[PDB]
Every structure is written in structure tokens, then in C-alpha cells.
Design a protein around this ligand. Structure first.
Ligand SMILES: N#Cc1cnn2c(Nc3ccccc3)nc(NCc3ccc(Cl)cc3)nc12
Length: 328
């Protein structure tokens, strides 16, 4: 059995109105209020367009959803509403649907994002600490509100580099945390899936997002996209084991009485732990200081219970200049 070490009782103490999302009655806005200006992305669940609010002429993001279950859509909407106004949490502006096709569209605030594939390589040491700190704010906030994002990755972190503004988006996989509840491990994107998901540990918690954040952090300071590059869920665990080592994995599995599928256990094999500095090179030298390594080490732990919480991460000395700057 496993439970979160913080914010475990948030949804226990709050009224059903807060977490009983299936009771939500969607209030639709007016589709004609928003017009498409250009497509900016696509995905398995939606088509994304930069749009504009014809009323106030303000930019927005229109996500036209592909067929989705009433249950799933209400969950994303309820969570967005609960987190409204939180630090760096994307704002849901409106919800509309096309009467004839019944196609729903979610309207979000616009963020002039620079593809991480091009942005990250230009980030300085300070930029990295700054943006990761900002992302942490959003995570501690949602976790403090009894919610797990479950899909933290560069594609879901919008950044207007010019304005140094960051927003954590796409809460379609997020879930409310309930002590002891068994969740579906089929969440997050492969390169950012934590060990718990890869070994089928279902009673995971907020800590899952901290592994994901760590993967992003490792990618930034080591200049690797992504850091753990696996081809399928089994290979993903292998790539991880080849870094943290199998000793740590076995200890993890024995602590939670988990048995790897024979094939998987066969693929992982046996590996030694590799020091983080073995990934340093002339390209990521100006970014891999001892503080960065110490912080990364405390995030990428097999045991989700050992990882820093978002609040702890924000206080790590690695971020001291970012904190000092803010309190000005
Ligand atoms: N909610 C919300 C949300 C807010 N902004 N936003 C943006 N902004 C944007 C603006 C200009 C160019 C590209 C994106 N894109 C996407 N989704 C599309 C997308 C495109 C590229 C990448 Cl890398 C990630 C996401 N979702 C959102």
C-alpha cells in the first residue's frame, strides 16, 4: 500500500462538489465568439488553433476535441475550474460545441510559445532554474489542491520566452488524488513515465509528476531530448535501469511487493548505477553544476516516496537566486 506524503487528505476534507466531477453540469458559451486564425498543433485528442475572441479582439487557443466520453471531458473541465487563478495554471476561458456534430471545443488563454525543441537549446543556466522554478509553482499548487497532472512534459509547458511567462497546460489526463485509490497506469507520455507506471504500481500519487519534471530537468541541463529515450514502455524502463542501476530497481520492487513481467525482467537485465557526471560534455558544461546534479538526483528516484515534493524542490539551494530575485 502507498499513499502521498503530503496533501493526502485534500479531497477527504473537501465537499463532494469539489471532486465529484461527474456531477458537473457543463455550461456552454457561444461558438461564434471565437474564430480560428491559424492551426498551431494537433494530437490524438484534438486540433489546436490560435484564435481570437471577436468580442474583445483578444487572442486565445481553440482546442477542437475529437470524439470523447462525457466522463473524461467533465473531468478535465472540473479540474481546470478548480485550479483557476493558480500560479502558472493555464486559464480555461470558455467551452463551446457545434450543435449538428456535437463537437466540443475548449477555449484557453493564448501563450506565444516557442517550440521546446528550439527554445531549450538557447536557455542559459539562469533561464533553466527560473523556468523550472515557475513550473514547480504550478505543480505544488495543483498537488495542494488534490490534483495530479499526470502528463508533465515540454509539449504541455507553454513558454513565451520574450515575456518569461510559463503556463502548465493540457489537463486532460489529470486526476483527483484519493488516499489508496488505484489509478490507470496508462498516463503521461513515454519518455516522462515514472517507474511506478512502468511496473504497474497503481496506487501512485503526486510524486509521479516529480519524476516527469526530473526528466525534463535532466533533458535541459544535459542538453538531451529526451533524456530517457525508449521505444516502448518496456524499453523505457530499460533505459532508466541502465542509468539508475538494477540494484535500485530490485529494492523498489521488493518494497512494494511487485513482480515484473518475465519478458520485461529479461529485457532489463542487470546494470550498474552510472554517475550523473558521466553525461557531462563540452555542450552542457556551463549547465551541470553540483547543485543541479544534487537536485536532479533527489527527483529521479525509483521510489516515488523518496522523491522531493514540489514544495521541497522549490526550496533547494539550486533555486536560491531565483527565490532571492522574486522576493524583491
Ligand atoms: N491550453 C493551452 C495553450 C495555450 N497556448 N498554447 C499554444 N500556443 C502556441 C502558440 C503559437 C505557436 C505554438 C503554440 N499551443 C498549444 N498547443 C499547440 C502546441 C504547439 C507546439 C508545441 Cl511544442 C506545443 C503545443 N496549446 C496552448
Amino acid at each position: 500500500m502507498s499513499k502521498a506524503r503530503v496533501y493526502a487528505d485534500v479531497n477527504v476534507l473537501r465537499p463532494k462538489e469539489y471532486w465529484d466531477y461527474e456531477a458537473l453540469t457543463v455550461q456552454w458559451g457561444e461558438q461564434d465568439d471565437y474564430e480560428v486564425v491559424r492551426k498551431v498543433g494537433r494530437g490524438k485528442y484534438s486540433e489546436v488553433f490560435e484564435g481570437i475572441n471577436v468580442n474583445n479582439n483578444e487572442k486565445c487557443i481553440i482546442k477542437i476535441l475529437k470524439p470523447v466520453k462525457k466522463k473524461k471531458i467533465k473531468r478535465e473541465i472540473k479540474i481546470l475550474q478548480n485550479l483557476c487563478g493558480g500560479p502558472n495554471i493555464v486559464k480555461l476561458l470558455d467551452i463551446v460545441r457545434d450543435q449538428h456534430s456535437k463537437t466540443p471545443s475548449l477555449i484557453f488563454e493564448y501563450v506565444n510559445n516557442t517550440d521546446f525543441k528550439v527554445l531549450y537549446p538557447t536557455l542559459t543556466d539562469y533561464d533553466i532554474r527560473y523556468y523550472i522554478y515557475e513550473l514547480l509553482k504550478a505543480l505544488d499548487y495543483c498537488h495542494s489542491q488534490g490534483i495530479m497532472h499526470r502528463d508533465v512534459k515540454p509539449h504541455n509547458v507553454m513558454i513565451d520566452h520574450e515575456l518569461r511567462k510559463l503556463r502548465l497546460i493540457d489537463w486532460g489526463l489529470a486526476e483527483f488524488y484519493h488516499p489508496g485509490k488505484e489509478y490507470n497506469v496508462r498516463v503521461a507520455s513515454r519518455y516522462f513515465k515514472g517507474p511506478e507506471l512502468l511496473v504497474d504500481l497503481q496506487d501512485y500519487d503526486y510524486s509521479l509528476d516529480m519524476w516527469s519534471l526530473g526528466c525534463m530537468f535532466a533533458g535541459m541541463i544535459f542538453r538531451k531530448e529526451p533524456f530517457f529515450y525508449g521505444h516502448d514502455n518496456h524499453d523505457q524502463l530499460v533505459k532508466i535501469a541502465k542509468v539508475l542501476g538494477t540494484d535500485g530497481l530490485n529494492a523498489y520492487l521488493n518494497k512494494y511487493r511487485i513482480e515484473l513481467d518475465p519478458q520485461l525482467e529479461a529485457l532489463v537485465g542487470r546494470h550498474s548505477r552510472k554517475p550523473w557526471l558521466k553525461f557531462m560534455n563540452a555542450d552542457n558544461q556551463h549547465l551541470v553544476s553540483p547543485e543541479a546534479i544534487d537536485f536532479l538526483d533527489k527527483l529521479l528516484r525509483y521510489d516515488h516516496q523518496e522523491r522531493l515534493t514540489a514544495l521541497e524542490a522549490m526550496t533547494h539551494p539550486y533555486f536560491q537566486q531565483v527565490r532571492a530575485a522574486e522576493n524583491s
